[PDB]
């Protein structure tokens, strides 16, 4: 409901939708997300598939399950770009998953959940880092 928030939801939603469907600051972040995020998905494919299964076994809602898991990642009080990029990446992996089970309409809310957790709970952190400009330079 602000400019960090809508700019975050722009990047995340876009990345998740283009991953599922196979194909200034925001656009640079998206480029970085494609480079790094596609990497994470290749290299942690076995782990991601294991986690997806686990989520599905406990069928409590894919985007809600994602939300609980995502909150737990940050419970130790540490925040960093690795954590943020790994979660968006796992989000993309789950978004591809939702598309393969003819549940594309759940991708938009997935994207919102991730953004909510990010901007709502890590705002202070995101500001000190110069938002998505920090992200781009961290992985540059």
């Amino acid at each position: 409901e602000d400019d960090l928030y809508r700019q975050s939801l722009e990047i995340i939603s876009r990345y998740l939708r283009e991953q599922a469907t196979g194909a200034a600051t925001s656009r640079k972040a998206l480029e970085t997300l494609r480079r790094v995020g596609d990497g994470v998905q290749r290299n942690h494919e076995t782990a991601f598939q294991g986690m997806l299964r686990k989520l599905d076994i406990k069928n409590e809602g894919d985007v809600k399950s994602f939300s609980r898991v995502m909150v737990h990642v940050f419970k130790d009080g540490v925040t960093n770009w690795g954590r943020i990029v790994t979660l968006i990446s796992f989000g993309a992996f789950v978004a591809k998953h939702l598309k393969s089970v003819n549940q594309e309409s759940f991708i938009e809310p997935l994207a919102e959940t991730i953004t909510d957790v990010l901007v709502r709970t890590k705002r202070d952190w995101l500001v000190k880092q110069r938002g998505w400009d920090g992200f781009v330079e961290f992985f540059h």
């Binding site: 986690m51 898991v69 990642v73 770009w81 954590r83 790994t86």
Partner: peptide, 19 residues
């Protein structure tokens, strides 16, 4: 709960490596 803790820590460790 334990399955969400396990998955969360699992993502945390790989994330901290990438970082």
């Amino acid at each position: 709960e334990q399955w969400a803790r396990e998955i969360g820590a699992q993502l945390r460790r790989m994330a901290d490596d990438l970082n």
